[PDB]
């Protein structure tokens, strides 16, 4: 659930700021190399706040047709820590005087 919560609020913030930047509809003359750059910029800002560990900017792609853009991406999540086990062994060694 907590992974889903982090995802839900990340995608919502992403979905919101994509409205202002591109879905404001100002023109078609802002092509797909700018959208790729904007998603890289924004992944940088979330990396600054450590909410995502890192992102492979090379593996981000954009395709545009008419007034629709299709985007692929990859994110490294903040990796969790599930289990520990400890081998505790007793030994003896002499105190002396």
């Amino acid at each position: 659930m907590a992974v889903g919560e982090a995802n839900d609020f990340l995608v919502s913030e992403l979905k919101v700021q994509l409205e202002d930047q591109f879905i404001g509809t100002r023109t078609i003359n802002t092509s797909a190399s700018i959208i790729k750059d904007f998603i890289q910029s924004y992944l940088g800002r979330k990396k600054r706040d450590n909410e995502i560990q890192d992102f492979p900017a090379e593996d981000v792609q954009v395709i545009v047709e008419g007034n629709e853009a299709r985007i692929s991406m990859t994110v490294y999540p903040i990796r969790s820590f599930k289990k520990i086990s400890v081998s505790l062994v007793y030994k003896q060694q002499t105190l002396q005087a």
Partner: peptide, 25 residues
């Protein structure tokens, strides 16, 4: 599988005859 707790450079080789382990590994 639930989250729980409970309580040098020069590599070296050895080869010889003893009891145990898979053959030829």
């Amino acid at each position: 599988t639930r989250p729980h707790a409970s309580i040098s450079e020069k590599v070296f080789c050895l080869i010889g005859q003893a009891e145990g382990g898979e053959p030829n590994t």
